[PDB]
Design a protein around this nucleic acid. Structure first.
Lengths: 124, 131, 92, 119
RNA sequence: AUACUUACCUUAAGAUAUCAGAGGAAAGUCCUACUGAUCAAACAUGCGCUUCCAAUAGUAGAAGGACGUUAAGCAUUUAUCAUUGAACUAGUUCAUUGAAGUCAUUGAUGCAAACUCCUUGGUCACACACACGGCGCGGAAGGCGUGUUUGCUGACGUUUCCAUUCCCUUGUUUCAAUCAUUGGUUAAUCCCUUUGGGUUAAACUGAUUUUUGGGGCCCUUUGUUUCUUCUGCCUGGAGAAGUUUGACACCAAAUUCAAAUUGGUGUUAGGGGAGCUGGGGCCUUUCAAAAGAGCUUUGUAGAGGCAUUCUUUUUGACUACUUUUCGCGUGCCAUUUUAGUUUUUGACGAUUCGAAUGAACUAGUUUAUGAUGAAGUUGAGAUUAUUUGGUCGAUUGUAGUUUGAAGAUGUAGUCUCAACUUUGCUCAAAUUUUGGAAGGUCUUGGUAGGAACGGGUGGAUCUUAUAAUUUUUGAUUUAU
């Protein structure tokens, strides 16, 4: 499927589509953007998947097909208290090289902003 | 002992490639599951209804054609009139198949059971094909 | 942290809530603090068992909040800029 | 003293992280945060079977286990295998570390000595 | 943007890898672009490392979705509580009064299929190739390893700071014709010293460039190549200007009254080549270190050994012999007009040629014929068996050695081992590993900012407040 870097922390992984497990047995799958000290994180396009009480008997030990009722909720902010564990689903729309490119161009543009602001403030 | 053409070259792992090939032939076969794959040694079956082993090299000469061997010759042909010249298609492509010009190597282990000289001859003529 | 700052950026916009008790409060966000406790205006409430009601004003404790749904257009909001250039802070 | 600083020297070891759910995780261990957030690499995480003539297992842990995406369809018992699970710190109950490593070398904290050596 | 008025408010703390050793200002601290080890980051760079990257020899297929249809699909289960009166069995129906009351019953739950539609990929190159399971060019994602730099990282300010480039192209590819440029080969003529060198014109061949024509693929580039602006295009792929203290596009306003004004968001791109520069692999040369190619005697150095005796006791310990009680060897050197097995195919199946037969094609060619011809004995070693040559456990007593206790008496030389040198006898040169310098070749990366210094600087990380209701030191394994 997908191989995550053998040493990769929550800061190394951004924009990866994640799979988030809460205490209540439901899952939030989507792109991570930010997170925090106490690990409450922000997902971009996320869908909460749930195993109904009626399908649950199908998971108890004996090819299984579970009907997982899920609903779509975009740009949420989770709470660190509820989060249990996190897994990686996919890798970002952009490669590593391309993200280096956009990072460098973004930084250069950011410096250009500071110069254009400084010299717009100084003379007038 | 059977011979194919224009199969997908792209999967690079023989056990994954035999997964795909076996998957197109027999849906709901033994192995859609993927814990493990069997490996008969030179001199057990892969799938029911005639299949035994699968052979693929990476060589530029053998690139797209992968060969199948069967339990016996009448079942080897029985697989051929299963479709009866109605072309099945693997991943992207209809395959054109025929009888192998050389007999199945693992079928020789079954025949003579019913083979050190062949292994000597293969090392010799291989040594000469290197030249 | 950024997750709370995005909640402060969502003031005056329709947001959704999930309390850990199971209810759902969807309505317009008036106030939010750094303790994540928010107060909402003109909100529709869904009880854990589905019974839906309507209340004009509500205040919820942040510890009981589970997830908050925020208008999607805040995704590209400047909080998420990785490389950003700030000026020098004023001397006081 | 913070004993979590011990776990940070256990890096690259086979370990079971036995959580509050009863879920057990066998895996190779990577950097452990100061809040005891434990990040693993190649993990097989499962639930034990209370026998007791069919005593229903944890109902939340089965759902959380199927929802990792790592449970394969043909598993007879209840397990899942996946790469890279990151575990919040407050979820951990017990940690079973291997028998081989010696504690006397790892249980020495450099800050504890540093405080005494300096005074 | 400036001036005035009013309101709201002001600094959690500390730190930036660890360990060890040497040095500077008995204890501790601080410090050393000091020395080692380990760790971490960035940057390079490698591995026959691992996985993945879609049909055009066809109207497909892989992954993921539909908050899509069939679809009132099929199979199930559900629609409030209390008070009073009438009838009623001994709970049921109707009417009235009060309380709350997600919508749905075309619902909800379970089961399964068919169809349709969306997003994504190198839809690359070479190949249609009878094998025993590779070593085409790239891209994505990892694992492992070596090397360099740095020790969290970035903006800002200061400096005898150091820096300091170009060209072509923006459909692409291929062939042909002709033009131009450079190089090699052959023939002829002339000159100088049969041979060599130079020049001449001519012929052939390779590479590069200009103009035309032909072919192929692409044009969704949908605002017709998307780096801008302006001109412009399908009978065409074009032309002009410009490229970061700047230009352009766009959004917002209120007025003026179509420009600008002020505040904001975004674009300034891709490809190739020359130069310069960083890294890697290979080759050649130069240098430094290390090593490898018998016996006897003599000399030197180092190491080891060599100076109390006698008697008694220890079912104290060990070894050997003999006695008492409960032919064999799992044993070995030499020889079989000795035997058996293996090994050396030591020596005395493949390829080529000729002949015959069959089949196919137009006497010739090809294929096939376990299809013919030609190119057991001896010796040595090892193992086993046989034969004669042949050789060798427990209790008591004696002898030898070691240890302990008691009593009595007295107070430099030699040998062996190792290293070096010289002489006799026999049978400086070259090779390899490690490290440095130069040149060549292949390959890859970079190509406009970088270094030092400085702070009442930003952000990351760590330590402590911080295990006491608002997230990480437990009330969701449903429990008695």
């Amino acid at each position: 499927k997908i191989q995550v870097a053998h040493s990769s922390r929550l800061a190394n992984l951004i924009d990866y589509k994640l799979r988030v497990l809460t205490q209540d047995g439901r899952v939030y799958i989507g792109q991570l953007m930010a997170f925090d000290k106490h690990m409450n994180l922000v997902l971009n396009e996320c869908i909460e998947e749930r195993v109904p009480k009626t399908q649950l008997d199908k998971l108890r030990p004996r090819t299984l097909n579970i009907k997982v009722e899920k609903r779509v909720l975009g740009l949420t902010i989770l709470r660190g208290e509820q989060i249990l564990s996190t897994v990686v689903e996919d890798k970002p729309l952009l490669s590593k090289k391309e993200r280096l490119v956009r990072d460098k161009k973004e930084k250069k543009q950011a410096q250009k902003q500071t110069k254009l602001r400084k010299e717009k403030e100084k003379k007038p | 002992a059977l011979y194919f053409q224009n199969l997908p070259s792209r999967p690079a792992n023989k056990e994954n490639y035999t997964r795909l090939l076996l998957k197109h032939i027999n849906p709901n076969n033994k192995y859609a599951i993927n814990p493990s794959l069997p490996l008969p040694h030179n001199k057990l079956l892969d799938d029911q209804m005639g299949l035994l082993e699968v052979s693929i090299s990476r060589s530029s000469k053998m690139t797209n054609q992968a060969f199948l061997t069967f339990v016996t010759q009448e079942e080897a042909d029985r697989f051929l009139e299963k479709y009866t010249t109605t072309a099945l298609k693997v991943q992207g492509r209809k395959v054109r198949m025929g009888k192998a010009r050389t007999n199945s190597l693992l079928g020789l282990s079954i025949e003579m059971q019913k083979t050190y000289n062949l292994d000597i001859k293969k090392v010799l003529k291989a040594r000469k094909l290197k030249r | 942290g950024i997750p709370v700052k995005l909640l402060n950026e969502a003031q005056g916009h329709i947001v959704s809530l999930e309390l850990t008790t199971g209810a759902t409060y969807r309505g317009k966000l008036v106030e939010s603090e750094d303790s994540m406790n928010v107060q909402l205006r003109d909100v529709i409430a869904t009880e854990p068992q589905g019974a839906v009601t309507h209340m004009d004003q509500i205040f919820v404790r942040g510890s009981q909040i589970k997830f908050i749904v925020v208008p999607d257009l805040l995704k590209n909001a400047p909080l998420f800029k990785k490389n950003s250039s700030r000026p020098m802070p004023p001397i006081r | 003293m913070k004993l979590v600083n011990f776990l940070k020297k256990l890096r690259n070891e086979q370990v079971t992280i036995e959580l509050k759910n009863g879920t057990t995780v066998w895996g190779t261990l990577q950097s452990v945060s100061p809040q005891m957030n434990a990040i693993l690499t190649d993990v097989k995480l499962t639930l034990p079977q209370p026998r007791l003539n069919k005593l229903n297992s944890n109902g939340i842990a089965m759902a959380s286990l199927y929802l990792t995406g790592g449970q394969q369809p043909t598993a007879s018992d209840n397990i899942a295998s996946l790469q890279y699970i990151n575990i919040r710190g407050n979820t951990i109950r017990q940690i079973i570390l291997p028998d081989s490593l010696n504690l006397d070398s790892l249980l020495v904290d450099q800050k504890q000595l540093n405080s005494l050596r300096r005074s």
